[PDB]
Amino acid sequence: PTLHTCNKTSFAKAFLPNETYRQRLLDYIAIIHQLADHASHALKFYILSTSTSSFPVVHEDTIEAILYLLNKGEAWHPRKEAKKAWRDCLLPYVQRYCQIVGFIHPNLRGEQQSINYLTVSMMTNLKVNVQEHFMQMLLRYINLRFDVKGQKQRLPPKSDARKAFFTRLRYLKSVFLFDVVPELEFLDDLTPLESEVLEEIWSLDLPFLPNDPLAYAIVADPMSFFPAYCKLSGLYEQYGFQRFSAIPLRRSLIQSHVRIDTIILYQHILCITRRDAETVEKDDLWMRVCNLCTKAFRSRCGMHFEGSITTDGASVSVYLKHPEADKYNTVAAEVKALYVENNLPACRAAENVVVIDPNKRDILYCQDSNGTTFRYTANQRAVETGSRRFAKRREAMKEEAGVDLIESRIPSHKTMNLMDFTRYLLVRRADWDRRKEFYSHPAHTRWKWHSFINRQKSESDLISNMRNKYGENFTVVMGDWSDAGRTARFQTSSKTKGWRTLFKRNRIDCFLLDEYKTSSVCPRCSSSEFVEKKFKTRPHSRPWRRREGKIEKVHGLLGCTNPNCLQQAWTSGMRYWNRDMLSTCNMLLIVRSMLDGHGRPEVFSRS
DNA sequence: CGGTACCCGGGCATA
DNA sequence: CCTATAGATATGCCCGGGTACCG
RNA sequence: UCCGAGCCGGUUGUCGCGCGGUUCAAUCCCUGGUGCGGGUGCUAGUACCGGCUCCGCACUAUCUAUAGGU
Ligand SMILES: [Zn+2]
């Protein structure tokens, strides 16, 4: 549901100036971060080591058992039969992993809450990693085996050869992905490069539903695909393809956010017996360590603190929880539920309408009916957010600390071979002490929190400037990055949710409009037969491409050659235009046509 | 010295 | 540095450590 | 892996213009903003006329982890 919110504040303003409590909390979060990292590494090691017999069906019990083992040793005494069996199976592998890494059991007490939270988080990471990326990686492997990389340089752009190649590509995938039932003659209709693909795909033991497609089966029981997914990465390793993280790893040594609640408070922070804690109200028990009067803890939209924070030693994210909280395909409509054509009744009553074109450099280029232009570029975000300022010093310190030569030697972590994974673990352990000392510096977390502060300030200033230029109330109509080869969820509508969310937070209505044929029409003559693009050339701006002698045609510059737009005095012979200006003018024309009821003009249509 | 039963705090199960 | 998913705690019961009393 | 923004021109609604001119923005410390009252101070003219800075009331801002993309 949508019954929760978060407010992030600084560590100093969160906890009262009690040095003992702060030190206890810092030690606890460091221990929890170490436990989580070692648990992820041990889970991957166990999964790799058991491939010789069978890929285990990892369960929440598995993660909980791994965490409890790393924490205690053989002292864990679960009473549940499933947990007991998982403990018995995992103990040798965890022992070997600890011996290889030299990990010493922290013997932390009261591990129930933290272990449960980390188990839930890791299982969620497995579920999400298996849900979507499984199909995408399978399709990527199928494309790579067919050598589409080379075929793109072998087939004419539109000739019948490319059509036949596309037909074959879908024909093979339908049988491989269980989309269409094959006939017997399909057996002999396979070249060696295709027979190998069929055999490899079938060797993954893809689970499926007899009455539903593979994609629906993935959504229904995504975790059942976790074993096959682990197999898939192995193939990527055999053929040298772009490897993917089959089993997620918490590589970073920078102190990560750790969950703290009332139970953890009275177990490790306040250090009081449960019988004493149970006799005091939750809020009264929290005030002893946290300044509830701070702005971050105030209620919003009927939500209350409810004793949940996540802290990493530099910033604290306080979660506000609604009383109706959970207490621990049709969706395609959302693709077009927000588009302008379905929201015209609301657009007609908007005080002002602003059309925005996104670009990889001009992240926003906004124009209104009055012609007042505005833009928010990637340079402004990079400078104000401090991303480059932090990057040029945090990465530079590696020269002073010499850790750059350490991280580079680390082999790729996505390997699936047990020997290679052991090599990676040993190499990471070799210089683990120096990296741990380096990342313990407050500067890393301080920059991570200052980045959030700067991004929030930049986002607020952007809205302030937009309101100042266009007015207090306005409706945003933005393009969807349409092109001649973008027709899927992965490419068009997924690259705009950030700005839609940003506008929603400020209660600014945002709608999407088709960007197709936006750069075709000249508004001054409403004609596309006399529009020229990419005529002039200049040296490349990027420092490495520029020194290679590469010359690039201007992308954002367009021209109109129709005589009606040309003054006889102009020696250029063409009226110049900016790509963003023309796109905004065309979007304004389309919106005006839609509002009047005439609909999208035929010239901008996909006919 | 040798052998019992209770109160407490910690640990684990569960939705 | 961008985008996407799931989940975003609390109560009850078992047990094992130490302390109390008789022969 | 290198990059600020506003404005006037070369310019005609023109560029990642390594084109010219001019204004502030930034370096460090800071969770941001909105509407309401005072409370030291700093600014231009005889309480007004404001702007920067704090105090206090409610209105609001979804983060963790991983993964993918570069
Ligand atoms: Zn024209």
Side-chain angles (χ1 to χ4, degrees):
Chain A
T2 62
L3 299 172
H4 313 68
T5 47
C6 169
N7 300 329
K8 200 170 181 178
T9 178
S10 177
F11 192 93
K13 290 185 173 61
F15 301 96
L16 291 173
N18 188 322
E19 298 181 359
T20 303
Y21 294 171
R22 291 186 177 181
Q23 188 62 27
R24 289 176 177 179
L25 183 148
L26 265 61
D27 300 1
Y28 184 84
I29 61 179
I31 293 169
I32 294 301
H33 174 75
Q34 179 176 341
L35 283 174
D37 186 6
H38 283 78
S40 61
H41 276 85
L43 176 67
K44 185 166 176 60
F45 184 86
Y46 168 76
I47 291 168
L48 268 56
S49 182
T50 56
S51 61
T52 55
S53 61
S54 59
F55 294 90
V57 179
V58 301
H59 186 52
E60 298 177 359
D61 298 332
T62 313
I63 308 304
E64 182 177 358
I66 292 172
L67 278 164
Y68 267 103
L69 265 291
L70 288 175
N71 187 95
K72 278 198 179 73
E74 297 182 0
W76 196 40
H77 295 158
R79 292 186 291 93
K80 191 180 195 174
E81 296 295 349
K83 293 185 179 183
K84 195 182 297 183
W86 279 111
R87 170 188 176 282
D88 300 0
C89 181
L90 291 165
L91 173 58
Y93 300 92
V94 177
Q95 286 178 344
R96 178 157 63 265
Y97 167 84
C98 290
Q99 290 179 356
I100 292 168
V101 178
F103 167 81
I104 303 175
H105 306 279
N107 296 328
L108 180 67
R109 315 199 70 172
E111 325 109 47
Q112 185 65 10
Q113 297 292 334
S114 295
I115 289 174
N116 293 20
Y117 283 117
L118 294 182
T119 291
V120 176
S121 180
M122 293 175 66
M123 204 71 183
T124 288
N125 296 15
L126 298 179
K127 292 178 193 179
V128 301
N129 182 22
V130 177
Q131 274 186 1
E132 276 185 352
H133 298 281
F134 172 86
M135 178 63 65
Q136 186 170 15
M137 291 296 175
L138 191 63
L139 294 170
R140 192 200 209 92
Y141 187 89
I142 292 171
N143 298 15
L144 290 173
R145 290 305 318 273
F146 297 162
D147 191 2
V148 175
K149 175 183 176 183
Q151 292 291 357
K152 284 181 175 179
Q153 305 301 137
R154 192 67 56 82
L155 303 172
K158 190 172 181 180
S159 76
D160 297 70
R162 204 138 180 174
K163 181 184 71 178
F165 187 85
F166 279 51
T167 304
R168 186 68 171 185
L169 182 66
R170 192 189 176 183
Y171 176 84
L172 297 177
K173 286 183 174 178
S174 61
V175 179
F176 299 170
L177 302 179
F178 297 81
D179 189 4
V180 179
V181 175
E183 295 294 351
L184 301 180
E185 299 180 359
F186 179 88
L187 180 61
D188 299 330
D189 191 3
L190 295 172
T191 58
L193 300 178
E194 300 175 357
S195 180
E196 291 176 1
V197 172
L198 170 58
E199 293 293 352
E200 292 176 355
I201 294 290
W202 278 9
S203 68
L204 297 176
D205 304 329
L206 267 58
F208 65 93
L209 299 175
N211 302 329
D212 300 329
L214 179 59
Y216 199 98
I218 292 169
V219 179
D221 298 329
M223 197 65 189
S224 62
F225 293 83
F226 181 79
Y229 195 62
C230 290
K231 277 185 172 182
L232 181 59
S233 179
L235 281 60
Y236 277 70
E237 189 176 3
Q238 292 191 149
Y239 295 95
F241 302 155
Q242 189 176 12
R243 287 176 290 185
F244 58 86
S245 296
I247 301 89
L249 296 175
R250 299 197 175 187
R251 306 156 295 170
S252 179
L253 294 77
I254 299 172
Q255 180 56 27
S256 58
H257 281 241
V258 174
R259 181 76 67 172
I260 299 178
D261 56 357
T262 308
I263 307 304
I264 294 172
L265 274 191
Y266 84 74
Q267 280 190 349
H268 300 77
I269 306 305
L270 298 177
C271 297
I272 58 179
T273 58
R274 179 176 179 179
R275 179 169 61 176
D276 185 6
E278 292 290 356
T279 59
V280 180
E281 298 295 350
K282 194 188 300 184
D283 297 0
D284 297 0
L285 186 60
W286 265 90
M287 288 181 180
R288 299 183 182 181
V289 59
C290 292
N291 181 19
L292 278 289
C293 300
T294 307
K295 185 181 182 181
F297 299 86
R298 292 182 59 85
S299 300
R300 295 193 295 92
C301 193
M303 304 182 182
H304 302 70
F305 169 41
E306 294 294 349
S308 182
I309 64 181
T310 57
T311 178
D312 60 356
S315 60
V316 184
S317 293
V318 184
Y319 290 82
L320 305 182
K321 178 180 175 181
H322 200 262
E324 300 181 2
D326 303 70
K327 177 47 180 62
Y328 190 94
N329 191 14
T330 306
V331 299
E334 297 293 352
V335 181
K336 276 214 169 187
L338 299 173
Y339 269 68
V340 67
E341 57 270 12
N342 293 22
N343 296 268
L344 298 177
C347 293
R348 282 182 168 182
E351 299 294 350
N352 185 15
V353 179
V354 183
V355 293
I356 309 183
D357 192 329
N359 191 333
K360 282 295 184 65
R361 281 185 55 81
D362 298 69
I363 294 176
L364 304 170
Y365 197 96
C366 322
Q367 180 179 348
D368 62 331
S369 299
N370 301 270
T372 59
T373 59
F374 172 81
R375 65 171 182 174
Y376 180 84
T377 64
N379 320 346
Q380 183 177 359
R381 173 167 279 266
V383 174
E384 300 181 1
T385 306
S387 60
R388 287 204 180 93
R389 302 214 307 269
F390 302 153
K392 294 188 72 173
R393 293 209 299 269
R394 185 183 64 187
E395 306 297 346
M397 284 178 62
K398 300 189 177 181
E399 298 180 359
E400 183 178 1
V403 293
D404 58 330
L405 295 171
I406 295 172
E407 299 184 0
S408 59
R409 290 188 178 91
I410 307 305
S412 180
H413 64 277
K414 304 184 181 187
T415 184
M416 294 296 297
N417 189 329
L418 179 60
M419 302 179 181
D420 299 330
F421 191 67
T422 303
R423 186 202 307 273
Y424 159 81
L425 293 175
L426 293 174
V427 170
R428 189 174 184 271
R429 185 192 179 278
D431 301 330
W432 190 84
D433 301 330
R434 177 48 50 89
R435 289 209 299 171
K436 189 269 187 178
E437 182 179 0
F438 173 74
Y439 285 107
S440 65
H441 202 278
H444 305 277
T445 59
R446 291 280 293 179
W447 287 321
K448 195 168 182 294
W449 170 230
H450 291 192
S451 179
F452 184 94
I453 296 176
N454 299 15
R455 185 171 62 86
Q456 185 177 42
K457 267 210 171 188
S458 304
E459 290 179 1
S460 61
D461 298 330
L462 173 58
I463 299 299
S464 301
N465 285 270
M466 287 191 67
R467 274 173 167 173
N468 182 278
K469 292 180 67 57
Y470 297 105
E472 174 58 18
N473 190 331
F474 60 92
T475 300
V476 173
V477 178
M478 185 178 297
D480 53 357
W481 293 72
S482 301
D483 206 357
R486 309 175 185 178
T487 62
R489 153 185 165 97
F490 301 159
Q491 192 64 51
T492 58
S493 59
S494 57
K495 310 303 181 183
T496 312
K497 194 187 77 182
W499 299 116
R500 289 189 284 105
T501 300
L502 176 61
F503 296 142
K504 194 179 72 62
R505 295 206 305 268
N506 297 269
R507 286 161 174 75
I508 294 166
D509 298 330
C510 184
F511 300 135
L512 303 182
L513 175 63
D514 185 4
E515 196 171 2
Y516 178 76
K517 275 284 184 177
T518 45
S519 177
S520 178
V521 179
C522 169
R524 188 66 60 178
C525 58
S526 61
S527 180
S528 301
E529 290 71 2
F530 302 89
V531 176
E532 302 181 3
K533 177 170 187 177
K534 286 182 176 182
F535 36 89
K536 73 180 295 183
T537 54
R538 64 159 185 264
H540 212 275
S541 304
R542 297 185 176 179
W544 66 91
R545 298 304 187 183
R546 187 184 186 88
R547 288 185 289 184
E548 288 178 358
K550 300 292 174 294
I551 292 171
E552 179 179 0
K553 285 175 172 294
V554 179
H555 276 75
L557 180 62
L558 302 170
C560 187
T561 312
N562 183 267
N564 298 268
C565 288
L566 309 181
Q567 297 289 8
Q568 186 61 85
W570 297 349
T571 58
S572 302
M574 58 196 297
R575 175 182 276 271
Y576 301 102
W577 291 82
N578 190 325
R579 180 199 166 280
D580 303 0
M581 291 283 289
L582 283 168
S583 180
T584 53
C585 289
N586 289 310
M587 287 187 297
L588 284 171
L589 291 172
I590 294 167
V591 171
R592 189 71 222 179
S593 183
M594 289 181 176
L595 292 173
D596 298 330
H598 302 69
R600 187 182 182 88
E602 175 59 17
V603 68
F604 303 105
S605 298
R606 292 172 174 270
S607 61

